[PDB]
Ligand binder design. Structure first.
Ligand code: RQR
Length: 167
């Protein structure tokens, strides 16, 4: 049993809710919250900007030190950093940015990072401002992630469409 509430079960291991991931993280304080990161860990908008803002910019400060030491992530890659006031850990995952010619096939590689964590709170990678179709992102998630994933869909209209088109 875990403390996530009001999710619609989609499969054995995937659950979905219309939720703002920052508000959900603040309420649940999960072990792992997933950030929709870019390779530079520059947290400006969407999930990354919102999480970073909720940490009072501490996420960005930590991230800048990480990049100065390690260099950029790979598209499809990830790193584990602090969850600050929101979660124990933040898994920063880079999905391909469709609007800049990066392969959508890398979305599967991005979701594979989730399998290193038993339970996660995550948004739909590559969707929203990253330019890919959220219906596709949900399908790749379901077909790739085997650990327990609690998906936070920001928009109610989109949430309802994702549920309706699922089977
Ligand atoms: O930006 C987000 N998701 C994108 C992926 C699918 C779209 C959606 O979920 O409506 C948009 C996101 N998701 C969840 N909590 C938050 S809080 C700020 C942004 C955000």
């Amino acid at each position: 049993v875990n403390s996530f509430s009001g999710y619609l079960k989609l499969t054995d291991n995937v659950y979905i809710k219309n939720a703002d991931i920052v508000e959900e993280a603040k309420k649940v304080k999960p072990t792992v919250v997933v950030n929709a990161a870019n390779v530079y860990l520059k947290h400006g908008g969407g999930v990354a900007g919102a999480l970073n803002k909720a940490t009072n910019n501490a996420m960005q400060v930590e991230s800048d030190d990480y990049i100065a030491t390690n260099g950029p992530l790979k598209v499809g890659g990830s790193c584990v950093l602090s969850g600050h006031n929101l979660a124990k850990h933040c898994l920063h995952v880079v999905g391909p940015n469709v609007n800049k010619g990066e392969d959508i096939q890398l979305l599967k590689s991005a979701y594979e990072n989730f399998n290193q964590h038993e339970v996660l709170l995550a948004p739909l990678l590559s969707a929203g401002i990253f330019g890919a179709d959220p219906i596709h992102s949900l399908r790749v998630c379901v077909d790739t992630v085997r650990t327990n994933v609690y998906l936070a869909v920001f928009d109610k209209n989109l949430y309802d469409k994702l549920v309706s088109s699922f089977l």
